[PDB]
Amino acid sequence: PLIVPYNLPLPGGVVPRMLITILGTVKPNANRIALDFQRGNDVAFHFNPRFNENNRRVIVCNTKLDNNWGREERQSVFPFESGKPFKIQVLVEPDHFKVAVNDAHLLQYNHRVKKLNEISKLGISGDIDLTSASYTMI
């Protein structure tokens, strides 16, 4: 397994048609997972499954600019399961990141950070065993 937190460089930044695939297994009794597409210290796209936020399971998405979180976008479809293997696919489209989990579309996140070429690393953190993280062009 890859060591978490894991940094996946995205050479030259992201571009439409870039597909990121993450395979892992959620730990038993998991609390949180995060993907952070970063532009330097800024987080262009934070994707954050929370397994127990006031006894609800929710995915929180946001952007961090100059150390300030913005407006949260929340999704109650929650496809992660403690103890179970998952696949996350993040497809960069021209106007949003498009996320599917276990082959089912989950959400889209409109680009707030518009210098896509400067979003040149992906951090993967939280309560998973990380099997692989890679990218390809579709």
73 annotated among ligand-binding-site residues: yes
Query: Between residue 13 and residue 72, which ones bind ligand KOZ under the rule CB under 6 A?
Result: 32-34, 46, 48, 60, 62, 69, 72
The residues that bridge with 50 in the sheet, in sequence order, are: 32, 58
24 annotated among ligand-binding-site residues: no
| Separation of alpha carbons 70 and 113, rounded Å | 12
72 annotated among ligand-binding-site residues: yes
Binds ligand KOZ by CB under 6 A, chosen from 13, 125, 131, 135: 125
User: Is 74 among the residues that bind Cl ion (CB under 5 A)?
Assistant: no
CB of 122 to Cl ion, least distance (A): 17
22 binds, among Cl ion, ligand KOZ, none (CB under 5 to 8 A by kind): none
| Separation of alpha carbons 35 and 52, rounded Å | 18
How far is the CA of 123 from the CAs of 31, 53, 77, 86, 99, in angstroms?
A: 17, 22, 23, 17, 16
32 annotated among ligand-binding-site residues: no
Q: Which helix (H) or strand (E) holds 47?
A: strand 42-53
User: Is 126 among the residues that bind ligand KOZ (CB under 6 A)?
Assistant: yes
Closer Cβ to ligand KOZ, 48 or 89, answer by number: 48
Residue that is written with structure tokens 């680009």 in the block: 111
Output the six-digit token pair for 119: 């979003």
CB of 75 to ligand KOZ, least distance (A): 13
How far is the CA of 46 from the CAs of 1, 17, 28, 83, 138, in angstroms?
A: 23, 19, 23, 23, 23
User: Is 112 among the residues that bind ligand KOZ (CB under 6 A)?
Assistant: no
Residues at the site binding ligand KOZ, with contacts judged by CB under 6 A = 32-34, 46, 48, 60, 62, 69, 72, 125-126
